[PDB]
PDB file of C-alpha atoms and ligand atoms in Angstrom:
ATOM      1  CA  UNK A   1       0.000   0.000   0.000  1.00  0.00           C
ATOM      2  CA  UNK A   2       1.479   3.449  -0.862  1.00  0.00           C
ATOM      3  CA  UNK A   3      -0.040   6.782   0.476  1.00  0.00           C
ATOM      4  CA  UNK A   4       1.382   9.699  -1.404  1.00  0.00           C
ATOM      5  CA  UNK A   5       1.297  13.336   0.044  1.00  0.00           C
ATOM      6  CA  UNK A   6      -2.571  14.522  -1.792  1.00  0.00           C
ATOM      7  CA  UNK A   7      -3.987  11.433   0.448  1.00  0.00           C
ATOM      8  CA  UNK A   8      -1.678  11.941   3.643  1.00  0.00           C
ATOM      9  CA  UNK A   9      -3.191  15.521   3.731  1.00  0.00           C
ATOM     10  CA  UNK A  10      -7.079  14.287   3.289  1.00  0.00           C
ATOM     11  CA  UNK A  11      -6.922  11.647   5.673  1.00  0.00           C
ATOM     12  CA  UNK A  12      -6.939  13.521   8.943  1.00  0.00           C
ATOM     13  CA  UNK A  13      -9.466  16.132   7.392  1.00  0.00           C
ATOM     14  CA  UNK A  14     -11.896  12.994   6.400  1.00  0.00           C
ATOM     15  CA  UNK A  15     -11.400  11.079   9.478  1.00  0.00           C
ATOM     16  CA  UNK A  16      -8.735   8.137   8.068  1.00  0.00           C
ATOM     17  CA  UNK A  17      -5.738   6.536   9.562  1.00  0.00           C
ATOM     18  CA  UNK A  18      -3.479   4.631   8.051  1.00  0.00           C
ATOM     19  CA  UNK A  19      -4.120   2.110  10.823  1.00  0.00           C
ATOM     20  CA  UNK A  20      -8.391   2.452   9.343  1.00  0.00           C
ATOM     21  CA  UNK A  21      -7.238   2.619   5.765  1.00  0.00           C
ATOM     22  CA  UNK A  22      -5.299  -1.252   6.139  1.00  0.00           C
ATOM     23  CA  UNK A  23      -7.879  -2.408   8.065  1.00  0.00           C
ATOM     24  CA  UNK A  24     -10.948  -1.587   5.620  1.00  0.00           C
ATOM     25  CA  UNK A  25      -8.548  -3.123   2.611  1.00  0.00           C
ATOM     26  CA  UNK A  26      -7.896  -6.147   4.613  1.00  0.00           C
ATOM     27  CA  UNK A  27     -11.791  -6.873   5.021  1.00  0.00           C
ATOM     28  CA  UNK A  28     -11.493  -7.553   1.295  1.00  0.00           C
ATOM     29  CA  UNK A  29     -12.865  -6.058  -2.074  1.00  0.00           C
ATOM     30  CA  UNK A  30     -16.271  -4.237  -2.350  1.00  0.00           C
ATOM     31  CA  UNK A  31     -16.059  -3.112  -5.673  1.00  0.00           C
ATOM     32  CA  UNK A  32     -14.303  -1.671  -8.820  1.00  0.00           C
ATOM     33  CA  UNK A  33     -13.014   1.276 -10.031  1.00  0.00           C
ATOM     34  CA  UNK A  34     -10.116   3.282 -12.010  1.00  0.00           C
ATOM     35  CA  UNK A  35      -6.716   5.044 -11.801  1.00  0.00           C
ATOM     36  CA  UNK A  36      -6.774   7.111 -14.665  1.00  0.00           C
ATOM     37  CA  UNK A  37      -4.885   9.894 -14.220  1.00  0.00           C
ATOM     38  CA  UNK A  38      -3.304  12.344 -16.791  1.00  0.00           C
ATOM     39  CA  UNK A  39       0.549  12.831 -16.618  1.00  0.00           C
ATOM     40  CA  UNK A  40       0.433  15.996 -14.555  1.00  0.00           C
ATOM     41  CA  UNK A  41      -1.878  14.794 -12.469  1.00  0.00           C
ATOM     42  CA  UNK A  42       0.765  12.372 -11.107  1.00  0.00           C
ATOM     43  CA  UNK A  43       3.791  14.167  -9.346  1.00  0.00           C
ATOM     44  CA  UNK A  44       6.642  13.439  -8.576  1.00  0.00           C
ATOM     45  CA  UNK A  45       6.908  10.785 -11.687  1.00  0.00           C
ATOM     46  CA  UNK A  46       4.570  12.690 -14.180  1.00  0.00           C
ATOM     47  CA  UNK A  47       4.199   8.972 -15.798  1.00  0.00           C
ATOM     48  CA  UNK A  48       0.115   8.774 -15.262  1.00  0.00           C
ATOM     49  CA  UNK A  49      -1.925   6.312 -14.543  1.00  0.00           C
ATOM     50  CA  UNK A  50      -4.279   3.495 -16.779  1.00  0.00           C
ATOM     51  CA  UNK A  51      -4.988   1.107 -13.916  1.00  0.00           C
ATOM     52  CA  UNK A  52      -7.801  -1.179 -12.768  1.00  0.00           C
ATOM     53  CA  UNK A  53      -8.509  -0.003  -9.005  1.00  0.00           C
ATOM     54  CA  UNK A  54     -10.274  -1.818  -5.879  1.00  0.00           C
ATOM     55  CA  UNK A  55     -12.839  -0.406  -3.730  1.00  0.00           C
ATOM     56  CA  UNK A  56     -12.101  -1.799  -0.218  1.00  0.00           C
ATOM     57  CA  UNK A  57     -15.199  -0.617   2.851  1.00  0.00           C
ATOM     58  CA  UNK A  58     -18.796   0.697   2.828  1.00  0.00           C
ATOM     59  CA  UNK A  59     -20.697   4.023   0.769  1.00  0.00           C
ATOM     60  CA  UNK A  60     -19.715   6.443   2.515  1.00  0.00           C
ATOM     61  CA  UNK A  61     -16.668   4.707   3.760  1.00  0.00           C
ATOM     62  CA  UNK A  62     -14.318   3.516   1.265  1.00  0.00           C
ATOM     63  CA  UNK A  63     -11.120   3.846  -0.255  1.00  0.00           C
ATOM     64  CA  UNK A  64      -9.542   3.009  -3.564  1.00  0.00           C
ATOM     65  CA  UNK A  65      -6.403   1.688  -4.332  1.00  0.00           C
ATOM     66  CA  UNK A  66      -4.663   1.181  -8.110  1.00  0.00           C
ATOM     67  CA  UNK A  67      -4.107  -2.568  -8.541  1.00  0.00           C
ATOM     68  CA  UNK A  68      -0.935  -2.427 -10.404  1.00  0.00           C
ATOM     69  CA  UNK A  69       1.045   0.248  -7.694  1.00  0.00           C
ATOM     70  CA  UNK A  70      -0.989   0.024  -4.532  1.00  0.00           C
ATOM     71  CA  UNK A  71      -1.659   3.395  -4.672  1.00  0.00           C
ATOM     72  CA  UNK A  72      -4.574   4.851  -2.678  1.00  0.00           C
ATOM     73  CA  UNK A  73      -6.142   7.137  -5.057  1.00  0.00           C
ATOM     74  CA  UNK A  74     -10.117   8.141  -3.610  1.00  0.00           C
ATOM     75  CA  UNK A  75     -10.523   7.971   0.154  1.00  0.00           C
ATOM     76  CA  UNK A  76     -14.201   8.923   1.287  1.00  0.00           C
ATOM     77  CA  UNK A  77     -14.733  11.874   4.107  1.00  0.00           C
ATOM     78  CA  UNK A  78     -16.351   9.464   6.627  1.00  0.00           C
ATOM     79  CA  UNK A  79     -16.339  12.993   8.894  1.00  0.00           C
ATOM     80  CA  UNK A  80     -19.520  13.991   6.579  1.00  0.00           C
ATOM     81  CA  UNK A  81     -22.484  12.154   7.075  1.00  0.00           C
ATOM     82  CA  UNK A  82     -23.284  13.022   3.763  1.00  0.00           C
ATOM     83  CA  UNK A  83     -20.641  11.981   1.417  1.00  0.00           C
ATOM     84  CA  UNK A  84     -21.424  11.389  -2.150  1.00  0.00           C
ATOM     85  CA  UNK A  85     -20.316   8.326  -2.918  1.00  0.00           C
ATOM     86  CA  UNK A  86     -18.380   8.233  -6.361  1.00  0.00           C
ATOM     87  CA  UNK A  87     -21.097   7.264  -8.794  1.00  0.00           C
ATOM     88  CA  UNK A  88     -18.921   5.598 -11.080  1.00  0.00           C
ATOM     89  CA  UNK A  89     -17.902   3.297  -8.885  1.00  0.00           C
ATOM     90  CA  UNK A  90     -18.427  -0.238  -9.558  1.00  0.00           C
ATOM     91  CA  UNK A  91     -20.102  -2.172  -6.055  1.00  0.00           C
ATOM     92  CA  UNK A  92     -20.582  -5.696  -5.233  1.00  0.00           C
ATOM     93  CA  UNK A  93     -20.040  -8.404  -8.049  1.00  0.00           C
ATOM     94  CA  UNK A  94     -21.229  -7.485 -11.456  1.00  0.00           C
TER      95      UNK A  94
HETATM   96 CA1  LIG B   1      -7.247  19.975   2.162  1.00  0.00          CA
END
């Protein structure tokens, strides 16, 4: 699991540790999603990003993480009751 700086600055703001984040991955997949970034939108390396991505938790409470680097890329703000969940997101088996 990598957690690069974007993430390390939402986590405390939407009520993640890292210590949460490993535990909702370890209670397995919930759904599907994507890593596609464009190259700027992926410093340091400026390579980008055409992954497949996991959903690990709950709407509401989830995080994403890009199969191929183990990056998280989406964590949810579990500190709003009212989170809209990413509607692209992929849940449950298809
Ligand atoms: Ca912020």
């Amino acid at each position: 699991l990598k957690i690069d700086q974007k993430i390390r600055g939402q986590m405390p703001e939407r009520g993640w540790t890292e210590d949460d984040i490993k535990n909702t991955v370890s209670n397995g997949a919930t759904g599907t999603s994507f890593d596609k970034r464009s190259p700027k939108k992926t410093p340091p390396d400026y390579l980008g990003r055409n992954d497949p991505a996991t959903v690990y938790g709950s709407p509401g409470k989830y995080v994403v993480v890009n199969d191929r680097t183990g990056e998280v890329t989406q964590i949810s703000d579990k500190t709003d009751p009212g989170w809209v969940d990413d509607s692209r997101i992929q849940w449950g088996n298809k």
